[PDB]
Design a protein around this nucleic acid. Structure first.
Ligand SMILES: [Ca+2]
Ligand SMILES: [Ca+2]
Ligand SMILES: [Mg+2]
Ligand SMILES: [Mg+2]
Ligand code: NA
Ligand code: NA
Length: 342
DNA sequence: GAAGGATTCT
DNA sequence: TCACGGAATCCTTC
């Protein structure tokens, strides 16, 4: 099984430069201005010239400006980014129909039967990679390996505009030598718990019992890491189609008055439905980020589909459900739909 | 199960 | 109105 992974290089930034090639070379920064007071919001992701100064996705726009106040700060244009993404997603589809679209800027392709013997695989990387460059003016990094996990580590290790392979050999090394926080799925929270147990590399898992790890990371990740470590990991390229569609939005002020919150919640609902299209959800969920951030949520699953009209109402019920259990004020508000009808 | 929370990642 | 956006998914609840 050979797994070829394409992550696009700082995507939303790149697209903005492709649409405006005068930016290229400067440091472009793509953000989500919340109009909550002129520079309220967060970065979204950022050109390499910009990244290298510590301006990364997720930091506050005003934090970023203490760093690069002369860099180009553009507002996140999601649809533009999506139509440029599908063009690319389609291009790769032709290469190995057995693909799995990870995110807006990620795709796994299974090239097991399309090619055998990595030498071949690498060359395809160049083709795939070169073709997107050709068609979309978008540079991408390519990671190859026996499975999704390692294929992606390769891409991680080689970005931007990169192309790394990862033969078993190296793979067997990484099991032993690669730092555990760099294993995909593993973030700081779980990394810190792993250091505490003593585990720093994948191989270490086979030194600890397993029921313990379940204690601290839960069987789920507990099986996962042991699986990779074992070299016995294999998850074929599913093509998971979205299992959840939502929206959250940032109010221009914290609230506990509905009429105040209400116009946002619908603004969210209307979008969420456009995002849904021909899909009909059996479940709704109203999510609220508090003046604190305790990210509270009340929901409901109906035994039938939810019509837009029913999505309004219930939500207002669910917003009220929140408005009086906790007692804190609301920062962001939104809705999330699930449990679709096949 | 269904429900609500926590975690990971751009 | 005075730093923390948006989107999923998992992974663990009662
Ligand atoms: Ca990591
Ligand atoms: Ca299998
Ligand atoms: Mg990426
Ligand atoms: Mg990226
Ligand atoms: Na049960
Ligand atoms: Na019960």
């Amino acid at each position: 099984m050979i797994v070829l992974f394409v992550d696009f290089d700082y995507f939303y930034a790149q697209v903005e430069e492709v649409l405006n090639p005068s930016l290229k070379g400067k440091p472009v920064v793509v953000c989500v201005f919340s109009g909550r007071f002129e520079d309220s919001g967060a970065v979204a992701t950022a050109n390499y010239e910009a990244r290298k100064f510590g301006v990364k996705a997720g930091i506050p726009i005003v934090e970023a400006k203490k760093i690069l106040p002369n860099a180009v700060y553009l507002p996140m244009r999601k649809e533009v980014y999506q139509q440029v993404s599908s063009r690319i997603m389609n291009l790769l589809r032709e290469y190995s129909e057995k693909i799995e679209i990870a995110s807006i800027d990620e795709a796994y392709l299974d090239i097991s039967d399309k090619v055998r013997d990595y030498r071949e695989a690498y060359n395809l990387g160049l083709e795939i990679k070169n073709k997107i460059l050709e068609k979309e003016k978008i540079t991408v990094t390519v990671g190859i390996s026996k499975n999704k996990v390692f294929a992606k580590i390769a891409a991680d290790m080689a970005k931007p505009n990169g192309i790394k392979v990862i033969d078993d050999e190296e793979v067997k090394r990484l099991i032993r030598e690669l730092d555990i926080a760099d294993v995909p799925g593993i973030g700081n929270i779980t990394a810190e718990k792993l250091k505490k147990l003593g585990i720093n590399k994948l191989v270490d898992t086979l030194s600890i019992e397993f029921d313990k790890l379940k204690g601290m990371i839960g069987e789920a990740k507990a099986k996962y890491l042991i699986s990779l470590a074992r070299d016995e990991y294999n998850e074929p390229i599913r093509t998971r189609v979205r299992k959840s569609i939502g929206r959250i939005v940032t109010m221009k002020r914290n609230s506990r008055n509905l009429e105040e919150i209400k116009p946002y919640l619908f603004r969210a609902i209307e979008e969420s439905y456009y995002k849904l299209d021909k899909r009909i959800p059996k479940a709704i969920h109203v999510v609220a980020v508090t003046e604190d951030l305790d990210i509270v949520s009340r929901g409901r699953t109906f035994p039938h589909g939810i019509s837009k009209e029913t999505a309004y109402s219930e939500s207002v019920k669910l917003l009220q459900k929140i408005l009086e259990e906790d007692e804190r004020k609301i920062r962001r508000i939104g809705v999330r739909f699930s449990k679709f009808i096949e």
